[PDB]
């Protein structure tokens, strides 16, 4: 039940995000149609200052170009090269992989106990909200 | 003229897009500007392709760099 | 090429012999003893293998 | 299953904010309809998503900048190892140990305050 | 000696099934919140095409709307980008050892990194808390 | 049987209409042309929650072979919307000008089952369904 039920959780989540987009889009159109009115400004510009900033930040320049595809230009060349060097080497060592299965299991439980203890720590802490 | 052109990328103005488009055919700088300008991959690629195909002398190394860039936008 | 030719093809036999040897060492899958004897002929080690188990070699193997 | 519990607590929490920004939205405009007004929300929540996003952008450049340090590495990248696995795990069994320090570290610290309160 | 284990096996198994059930029917219901909250974002498609029709029988023009249309695309755009960044990271991960992806090796390197990441948190969420204590 | 009979044609028209504009020109008498295309009205209604929801359930409940086609259209339709949702919001909508986008995303991104179902589709050998299902999650993310 659990393993193929992940489906519902993922599906639900995506549906959530699409509904969020529509929510936002409906929220937004209720602020253009009732709202002009041509009143609208005040607070609006501040929204608008934030939005301006973020937007061409992004743009422009800089980012896009350079970075995204020095990375994609790049990635691929490393792909080509890695393949061969590969070739071989020569098997390997896979094999001996079974455990180190096993010992990681035991580190996993130790970490899960520490995380839940930190979380409780700060509980025993907001209460330090004293 | 000022070679302020890089600043041009920044300008948001709705007027700007048509400006670049009309001017698009030292125009190459305009185009280097244009593909860069297009955040969108598709539009950017279409330009570099034309850039490569273009009749002004541009080295093949660049022609290919355009394609390498354009292809990446795939 | 081997079987098709009515002829000597000593060369083909040798090369195929080298090929099989090259191949077995490269994948671990093929590896071992029934082989050393093999000095290319229609004494295909693989051929015998195919008859019993099946033709299914595996995915394509390529040189690294 | 365990893991599956946090997943629902996330879907819980979320359908709840979205039910609702969806509710700041219907019935607000429902009024309108009759004649009232609900809205400078948005301005709230819109600027709230901005603030929301503002950081997400930083996260993007943080990750981007990691990628190339990583690729960068990958380039150096190119050569055998059983000993290292061991060398790793003897280190993890140290790292967990100082971390535990700290957590008891904190935990006891909290405890102290909690004691002081009463 | 074995029988006892068997016991706390039975135990803790039907409390796992108390688990799943529950989480099961949970997912229905989070799921139903999604069928309702949807029919009725519209029937909110009345109330909003009415405003429209009404607003049209007005003087004219619409405005200061574009900004929002920009905001949503702007908010939307990066979402686009996160995907691309995801589409990269996976490729980078993919570039990594051949002849056997299915081995244990990568298994141990994945799991282990999972541990390392979790440990990181534990670190300064802890350091947080440890940090935080100073005000007190 | 009758149900699918009607549903299929509408989906086909739906898809065509989306295609009935060339979005790439902008991405890569104009005002009037933009007003005229059916794509505008199509998007407008699609945003309506009875419309998106109906399309979505088709995906939820999958599998005659005829029914399978309806499913393919459902997926392709959503993919197209996601791809150019932005274009509609910022490019197209203002030109003509009615209301905003948000309801659609919560229904898609938050409905989980849809996400899960699509994931399940990738495995399926119809390539159209699988290939597209894969794309959607990408756009949603």
UniProtKB/Swiss-Prot annotation, chain A:
It is found in: Nucleus, Nuclear pore complex; Nucleus membrane. Transmembrane segments: none annotated. O-glycosylated. Sequence repeats lie at residues 81-82. Belongs to the NUP54 family. It is linked to Dystonia 37, early-onset, with striatal lesions: A form of dystonia, a disorder defined by the presence of sustained involuntary muscle contraction, often leading to abnormal postures. DYT37 is an autosomal recessive form characterized by the onset of progressive dystonia, dysphagia, and choreoathetosis in the first months or years of life. Affected individuals show delayed motor development and may have impaired intellectual development. Component of the nuclear pore complex, a complex required for the trafficking across the nuclear membrane. Contains FG repeats. Component of the p62 complex, a complex composed of NUP62, NUP54, and the isoform p58 and isoform p45 of NUP58. Interacts with NUTF2. This is Nucleoporin p54. It comes from Homo sapiens (Human). The chain holds residues 364 to 493 of 507 of the full protein.
UniProtKB/Swiss-Prot annotation, chain D:
Residues 14-81 form a coiled coil. The modification Phosphothreonine is found at residue 31. It comes from the Eukaryota. O-glycosylated. It is found in: Nucleus, Nuclear pore complex; Nucleus membrane. Contains FG repeats. FG repeats are interaction sites for karyopherins (importins, exportins) and form probably an affinity gradient, guiding the transport proteins unidirectionally with their cargo through the NPC. FG repeat regions are highly flexible and lack ordered secondary structure. The overall conservation of FG repeats regarding exact sequence, spacing, and repeat unit length is limited. Belongs to the NUP58 family. In rat, the p62 complex contains two different isoforms of NUP58. Isoform p45 has however not been isolated in human so far. Component of the nuclear pore complex, a complex required for the trafficking across the nuclear membrane. Component of the p62 complex, a complex at least composed of NUP62, NUP54, and NUP58. Interacts with NUTF2. Interacts with SRP1-alpha and Importin p97 proteins when they are together, but not with SRP1-alpha protein alone. This is Nucleoporin p58/p45. It comes from Homo sapiens. The lineage of its organism: Eukaryota, Metazoa, Chordata, Craniata, Vertebrata. The chain holds residues 301 to 418 of 599 of the full protein.
From Swiss-Prot, chain E:
One of its GO terms (biological process) is positive regulation of mitotic cytokinetic process. Essential component of the nuclear pore complex. The N-terminal is probably involved in nucleocytoplasmic transport. The C-terminal is involved in protein-protein interaction probably via coiled-coil formation, promotes its association with centrosomes and may function in anchorage of p62 to the pore complex. Plays a role in mitotic cell cycle progression by regulating centrosome segregation, centriole maturation and spindle orientation. It might be involved in protein recruitment to the centrosome after nuclear breakdown. GO terms for cellular component: centrosome; cytoplasm; Flemming body; mitotic spindle; nuclear envelope; nuclear membrane; nuclear pore; nuclear pore central transport channel. Residues 1-92 are annotated as: Required for centrosome localization. GO terms for molecular function: chromatin binding; Hsp70 protein binding; Hsp90 protein binding; phospholipid binding; PTB domain binding; SH2 domain binding; signaling receptor complex adaptor activity; structural constituent of nuclear pore. This is Nuclear pore glycoprotein p62. It comes from the Eukaryota. Belongs to the nucleoporin NSP1/NUP62 family. The chain holds residues 367 to 502 of 522 of the full protein. Residues 1-92 form a coiled coil. The gene is NUP62. Its main location: nucleus. The modification Phosphoserine is found at residues 42, 52. It is found in: Nucleus, Nuclear pore complex; Cytoplasm, Cytoskeleton, Spindle pole; Nucleus envelope; Cytoplasm, Cytoskeleton, Microtubule organizing center, Centrosome. Contains FG repeats. Glycans are attached at residues 7, 102.
Curated annotation (Swiss-Prot), chain F:
It is found in: Nucleus membrane; Nucleus, Nuclear pore complex. Expressed in the testis. Plays a role in the nuclear pore complex (NPC) assembly and/or maintenance. May anchor NUP62 and other nucleoporins, but not NUP153 and TPR, to the NPC. In association with TMEM209, may be involved in nuclear transport of various nuclear proteins in addition to MYC. Part of the nuclear pore complex (NPC). Forms a complex with NUP35, NUP93, NUP155 and lamin B. Does not interact with TPR. Interacts with TMEM209 and MYC. It is linked to Nephrotic syndrome 13: A form of nephrotic syndrome, a renal disease clinically characterized by severe proteinuria, resulting in complications such as hypoalbuminemia, hyperlipidemia and edema. Kidney biopsies show non-specific histologic changes such as focal segmental glomerulosclerosis and diffuse mesangial proliferation. Some affected individuals have an inherited steroid-resistant form and progress to end-stage renal failure. Belongs to the NUP186/NUP192/NUP205 family. This is Nuclear pore complex protein Nup205. It comes from Homo sapiens (Human). The lineage of its organism: Eukaryota, Metazoa, Chordata, Craniata, Vertebrata. The chain holds residues 756 to 924 of 2012 of the full protein.
